[PDB]
Amino acid sequence: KVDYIAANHIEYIDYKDTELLKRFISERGKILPRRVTGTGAKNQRKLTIAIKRARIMGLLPFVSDE
Amino acid sequence: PRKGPVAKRDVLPDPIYNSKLVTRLINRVMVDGKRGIAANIIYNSFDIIKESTGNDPLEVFEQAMKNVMPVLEVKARRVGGSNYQVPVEVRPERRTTLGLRWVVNYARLRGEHTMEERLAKEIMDAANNTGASVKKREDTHKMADANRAFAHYR
Amino acid sequence: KKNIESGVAHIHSTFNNTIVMITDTHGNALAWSSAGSLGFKGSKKSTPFAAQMAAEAATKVAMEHGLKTVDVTVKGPGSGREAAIRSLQATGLEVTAIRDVTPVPHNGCRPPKRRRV
RNA sequence: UUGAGUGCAGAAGAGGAGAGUGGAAUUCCAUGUGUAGCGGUGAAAUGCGUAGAUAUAUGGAGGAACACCAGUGGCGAAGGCGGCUCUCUGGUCUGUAACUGACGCUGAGGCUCGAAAGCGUGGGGAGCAAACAGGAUUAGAUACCCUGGUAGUCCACGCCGUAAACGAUGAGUGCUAAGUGUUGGAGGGUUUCCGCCCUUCAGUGCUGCAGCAAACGCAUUAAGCACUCCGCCUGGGGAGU
Numbered sequence: 293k294v295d296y297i298a299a300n301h302i303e304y305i306d307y308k309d310t311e312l313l314k315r316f317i318s319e320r321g322k323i324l325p326r327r328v329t330g331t332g333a334k335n336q337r338k339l340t341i342a343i344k345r346a347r348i349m350g351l352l353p354f355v356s357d358e
Numbered sequence: 359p360r361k362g363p364v365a366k367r368d369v370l371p372d373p374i375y376n377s378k379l380v381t382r383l384i385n386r387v388m389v390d391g392k393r394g395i396a397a398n399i400i401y402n403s404f405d406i407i408k409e410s411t412g413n414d415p416l417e418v419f420e421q422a423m424k425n426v427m428p429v430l431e432v433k434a435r436r437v438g439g440s441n442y443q444v445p446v447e448v449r450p451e452r453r454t455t456l457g458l459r460w461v462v463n464y465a466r467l468r469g470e471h472t473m474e475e476r477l478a479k480e481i482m483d484a485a486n487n488t489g490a491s492v493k494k495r496e497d498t499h500k501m502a503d504a505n506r507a508f509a510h511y512r
Numbered sequence: 513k514k515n516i517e518s519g520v521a522h523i524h525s526t527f528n529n530t531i532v533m534i535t536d537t538h539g540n541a542l543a544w545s546s547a548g549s550l551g552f553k554g555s556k557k558s559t560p561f562a563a564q565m566a567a568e569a570a571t572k573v574a575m576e577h578g579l580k581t582v583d584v585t586v587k588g589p590g591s592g593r594e595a596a597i598r599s600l601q602a603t604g605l606e607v608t609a610i611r612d613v614t615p616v617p618h619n620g621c622r623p624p625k626r627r628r629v
Numbered sequence: 630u631u632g633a634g635u636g637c638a639g640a641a642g643a644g645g646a647g648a649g650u651g652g653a654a655u656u657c658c659a660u661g662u663g664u665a666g667c668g669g670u671g672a673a674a675u676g677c678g679u680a681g682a683u684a685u686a687u688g689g690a691g692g693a694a695c696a697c698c699a700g701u702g703g704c705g706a707a708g709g710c711g712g713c714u715c716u717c718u719g720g721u722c723u724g725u726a727a728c729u730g731a732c733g734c735u736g737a738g739g740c741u742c743g744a745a746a747g748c749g750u751g752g753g754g755a756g757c758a759a760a761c762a763g764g765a766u767u768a769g770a771u772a773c774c775c776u777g778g779u780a781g782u783c784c785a786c787g788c789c790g791u792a793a794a795c796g797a798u799g800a801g802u803g804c805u806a807a808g809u810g811u812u813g814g815a816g817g818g819u820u821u822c823c824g825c826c827c828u829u830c831a832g833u834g835c836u837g838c839a840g841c842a843a844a845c846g847c848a849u850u851a852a853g854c855a856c857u858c859c860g861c862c863u864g865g866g867g868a869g870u
Contacts, residue, residue, distance in 0.1 A: 298823070299821095299823070299824070316698095321697090322696090322697045322698085323698045325697090325698065325699075325700085326698080326699095333812070334641080334813090336700095337698090339698085340698050344651095344698095344712075345714085347651085347652080348650085348651055348714095354651095354652055354653070357611065357613070358611075440671070440672090507552060507556050507559055507561045507562060508555070508559045511559075522685070524683095526668090528668085528670080529667080529668080531684070533663090533684055533685070535663090535684095535685065538661085538662080538685090538687095539662080539685070540685085540686080541661095541662045541663035541685060541686095543663095543664095544663080544664080544684070546667085546683090548665090548668095548683095549664095549666070554669085554672085615654065616653080616654080617653065617655075617694090617695095618653040618654065618697090618712085619653095619654090619694060619695050619696055620653075620654055620655080620693065620694040620696090620755095620756090621693085621755090621756060622694085622757045622782095623756095623757085625757085627774075628773060629774065
C-alpha cells in the first residue's frame with residue numbers, strides 16, 4: 293500500500309544524486325529499512341551499494357550527531 | 359491482616375480534663391485488669407506537674423509530646439531480598455502511639471522510689487528537650503536519612 | 513578565576529558509579545565531583561541520589577569562577593542520567609543543549625564471556 | 630523426439646581466488662587542564678593511583694572484526710559465505726525450438742573436498758582466553774564470582790580427516806484435494822498496472838483432506854502410492870575394548 297519510490301521511471305541510481313538519495317537516510321544518518329519506507333526488492337540493494345560508495349568520497353556523512 | 363485493614367476502637371474522653379489523649383495514656387499504664395490505680399497515679403502526677411511551674415497538666419504534656427512524636431522510621435523490607443531498611447513516611451496515629459509508648463516505658467526506668475514522681479519528672483523534662491525520649495526521637499531521625507540514599511526510590 | 517563563563521559539563525555513569533566533570537569548551541579541567549568522594553560507598557554509589565549530590569558539589573563550586581550556561585555530555589548507561597541534569601537545573605544553572613554520546617562500535621571488538629550465576 | 634544435451638535471447642546472487650582501499654571502536658604513546666580517588670561485588674577483597682590516577686582535549690601507532698540496511702531473505706553438493714572497488718573464474722533459472730538423435734540413472738574398490746580443536750616452518754600480535762597467580766564464598770572448593778595472564782585465536786605453505794558434520798529423513802523419476810504468505814521470472818486484460826486482476830515455471834515457509842503411523846505426527850518441499858541402484862541392522866553389557 294505504501295507507494296513505491298520508483299513510480300517515476302528511474303533506472304540508474306548513479307550514487308551521486310544526493311538529492312535523490314536523501315529520501316532514505318535517517319534524520320540522524322542511518323539507513324531506513326524497507327518495511328519502513330516501503331521500497332522494492334531489488335531496489336533495496338542498489339540503494340545501499342550506492343550510498344556506501346558515496347560515504348567514502350565524502351558526499352555523505354558517516355555520523356551526523358554533533 | 360490478610361484480607362484488608364480493620365476497625366480501631368476509639369476511646370472516650372477523660373472525666374476531668376475531657377481529653378481523648380488522657381484516657382489513651384491512662385490505658386497505657388494499666389497492668390493486669392486493674393485500672394483505678396492507674397487513674398490515681400495519673401492524677402497525682404498531673405497535680406505534681408502543675409505544682410512546680412504551674413501552666414497546665416495538658417499544655418506541657420502536648421509540648422513533651424510534640425518533642426517526641428517522630429516523622430520517619432526504618433521499615434525493614436526485602437524488596438531485594440536483603441537487609442534493606444527503607445525510611446518510611448510514618449502515619450499520623452502511630453506517631454502518637456509511639457509517643458505514649460516511649461514516654462511511659464522509658465519513664466518507668468527513671469527511678470524515683472516514689473510511686474508517680476517517675477512520670478511527672480519525665481514529661482516535664484521532655485517538654486524542655488532533655489531526656490532520652492527526646493534523644494530517642496532524634497536517634498530515629500538520625501538513623502533515618504542515615505541511609506535514605508539507597509532506600510528511597512521504593 | 514578568569515571568569516570564562518562558557519563551558520561544557522560531562523556525565524559518565526556506569527552500573528556502579530557516577531561522575532560529573534565541568535570544563536570549558538576545549539576544555540581544560542575546571543571542577544568535578546563523584547559519589548566516590550562524597551563519602552558514599554560501593555553498594556550505594558549507583559543510586560539516583562548520589563547523582564544529585566555529586567552534581568551539586570560540583571556546580572556550587574564551578575559557578576564561583578564565573579559560569580552561567582553550560583553544555584551537557586551524557587555517556588554511561590546507568591541510573592543518574594535523569595537526576596543529574598535536573599539537579600544541575602535546580603541549583604541555578606543554564607542547561608541548554610543535551611546530546612547523548614554513548615560509544616557504539618562498528619563490531620570490531622570481542623566482549624568478555626557471559627557470567628554464570 | 631517427449632529424456633539428456635547443444636545454439637540463440639534474457640535474469641538474479643554474503644558462489645571462489647588474487648590485488649588494493651574506508652570509517653567507527655578498544656588499547657598503548659605524546660602533550661594541555663586537573664585533583665584524590667578510580668575499578669569491582671549478593672557483600673567484600675585483590676588491584677592501578679600524590680614518580681599525578683580515573684576524567685578530559687589534540688595528534689600519532691598498531692592489529693583485528695565489519696554498527697545501521699538485516700528479512701521463516703539470497704548463493705553454494707555439503708563444511709559454509711555479509712565494509713568498498715578492480716583482474717581472473719564456476720554454477721543455477723525463464724524464453725525460443727536452430728541442431729545431435731537415448732548419448733540415461735545409480736554407482737563396491739579409487740580419487741577430490743572437508744567446522745572447531747591440534748602439529749610443523751616463518752611472520753604478526755589490539756582485544757579475548759584453556760594452563761597458571763592472586764583475591765574472595767565454603768565444613769572442604771585445586772569450581773561457579775573478581776583482578777591479572779601464556780600458548781591459541783590472524784597471515785603463507787604443508788599435515789591430521791574428525792562433530793548433535795541434523796530435517797538424526799540416500800539418490801533418480803512419475804502419480805494423488807485445498808488455502809495462505811514470500812525471493813526470481815515469462816505471458817494475457819485493465820492500463821499512466823511501473824501501482825491491480827488472470828495463467829504458468831522455479832525455490833522457499835504455515836495450516837490442512839485422503840492415505841499412513843505403536844502413538845507423537847507427515848501430508849505436491851510426503852514419513853502416501855510405486856519401479857531401479859547403493860549403504861546399513863538383528864537383546865542389553867563386555868567395547869568401537
